[PDB]
Structure 1
Amino acid sequence: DIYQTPRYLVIGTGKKITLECSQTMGHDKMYWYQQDPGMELHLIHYSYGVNSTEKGDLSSESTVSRIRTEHFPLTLESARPSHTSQYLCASSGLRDRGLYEQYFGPGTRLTVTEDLKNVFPPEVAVFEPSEAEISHTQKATLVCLATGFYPDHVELSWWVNGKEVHSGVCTDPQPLKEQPALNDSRYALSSRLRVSATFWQNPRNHFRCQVQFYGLSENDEWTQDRAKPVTQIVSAEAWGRAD
């Protein structure tokens, strides 16, 4: 398969960044694409094989190395806010019928911030269903708000009685900027879990909104008095209400 590390990175302006891409398919052709949310893919680098390295369609400050077939690491010698986006590695090999089939890696989401003191975890709050909704519709919507987070590197899930659930859930596709006129604005995200009124009204039912936040690593420096915004799960919970 095709592999990329790290899944998420936040780093200060000016620092060196290496993004790893590896695969054990024996593939000679390999690719680096760049993509901002909602935009089109731009080929940034490619490689024909074991010792090949060519500039893609979009010019970049990044360079690449293909010293070995298995590895195609992308390097950014001094990060700038402008390098903020998603970086997708791909490979393709000879399949059948005379075809090269392109396989994409999981990607790395990169944010370059001015200062690591801009990095904040989410605060998470669960809001319990309205009694007016229950009596009107026989359904019960819980809302979860994750607020005040930077970077926008967050995974929100709902858990009911200890199992992650996807049915009855909608999470905003994109987070809100708290301050749209600012570059390192913090973010908010909303999610909804809808269940039946009888399910909510069972006090044995436990409902939990969980936000995985990807932040600083144990290698990052931190001189602030506030808690170091490391990678962490922030959660909030509610139990059923018998009315």
Structure 2
Amino acid sequence: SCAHMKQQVSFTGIQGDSARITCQVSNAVSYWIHWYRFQDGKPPQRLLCLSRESGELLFDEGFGSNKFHAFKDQFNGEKFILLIKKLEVRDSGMYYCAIWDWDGLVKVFGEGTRLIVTESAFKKKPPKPIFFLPTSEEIKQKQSGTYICLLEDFFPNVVKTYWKENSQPLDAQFGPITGGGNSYSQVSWLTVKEDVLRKNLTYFYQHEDLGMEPKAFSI
């Protein structure tokens, strides 16, 4: 019964606008949500910390309310927002929400929301999947099948994918995300043995355009 942090896979906003990075907490009692940033090249630092009870914020060295504000969403309950105001490109990076757990000796972080700041307006296109089933030649030759999913033509260059028949996600191979401009893509293949081939497995994927809940494909 450990504490989990659900964050949107990414947030992109036009430069000069705001950025609501959401974080939904599960099984936390710590009264204090922290916000950490990881900027590629710099050590990761805490921006600030918010009190779940009182609402007071404590900023860290060189951070302040002009650029950051942390609150608790009145809607949906137990949702917490880090609002990064007046976005710049130095503001790009990874934004995590964190808490203390297990009697305060371990700190638990969210999966992370990548903030990407576009120099101008941007098309927020969603990913399109295509699925290749295992062939009769591949089951004859290798006594196993391979489900190949190609997620194509999505923006931004951020996406999470997994497979689950079982509650724990299944171990797949994931390709490098390849693309440029306003189109990126990623392939992921799952080699499943000739026994579990009949089982109805389900393929899950998450992208900024589809919000917080994942999308699923059966068989």
| TM-score, structure 1 normalization | 0.60
Residues 1:14 and 2:24 are matched in the alignment: no
Alignment of structure 1 residues 23-172 onto 2, 5 Å: 25-27=29-31, 30-35=33-38, 42-47=44-49, 51=56, 53-56=58-61, 62-64=67-69, 74-92=82-100, 95=103, 100-115=105-120, 117-158=122-163, 166-167=169-170, 169-172=171-174
Instruction: Give the Cα separation in 1 of the matches to 2:144 and 2:24.
Output: 47
What amino acid is the match of 1:91?
I
Residues 1:192 and 2:185 are matched in the alignment: no
| TM-score, structure 2 normalization | 0.66
CA gap 1:137/1:197 in 2 versus in 1, 3 angstroms: same
Contact 1:151–1:215, Cα closer than 8 Å, also in 2: no
Contact 1:124–1:145, Cα closer than 8 Å, also in 2: yes
Instruction: Give the Cα separation in 2 of the matches to 1:21 and 1:159.
Output: 24
CA gap 1:146/1:165 in 2 versus in 1, 3 angstroms: farther
> 1:113-171 CA distances to partner (integer Å, 9 max, x unpaired)?
345543211121112334443232211212111011111343323365xx77734x414
What amino acid is the match of 1:11?
G
Contact 1:16–1:79, Cα closer than 8 Å, also in 2: yes
> 1:16-59 CA distances to partner (integer Å, 9 max, x unpaired)?
1233568762535x53211257x775114234966452324899
What amino acid is the match of 1:80?
E
1:225 corresponds in structure 2 to none
2:178 corresponds in structure 1 to 177
Contact 2:176–2:186, Cα closer than 8 Å, also in 1: yes
List alignment gaps of at least 5 residues for structure 1: 218-230, 239-243
1:215 corresponds in structure 2 to 209
CA gap 1:197/1:91 in 2 versus in 1, 3 angstroms: closer
CA gap 1:48/1:81 in 2 versus in 1, 3 angstroms: closer
What RMSD over aligned residues (CA atoms) do the two structures have, in Å?
A: 4.4
CA gap 1:52/1:232 in 2 versus in 1, 3 angstroms: closer
Which is bigger in relative contact order (C-alpha 8 A, separation at least 6)?
2
Q: Say which SS state the counterpart of residue 209 (structure 2) adopts.
A: coil
Identity of aligned residues (%): 20
Number of paired residues?
206
Instruction: Give the Cα separation in 2 of the matches to 1:199 and 1:26.
Output: 42
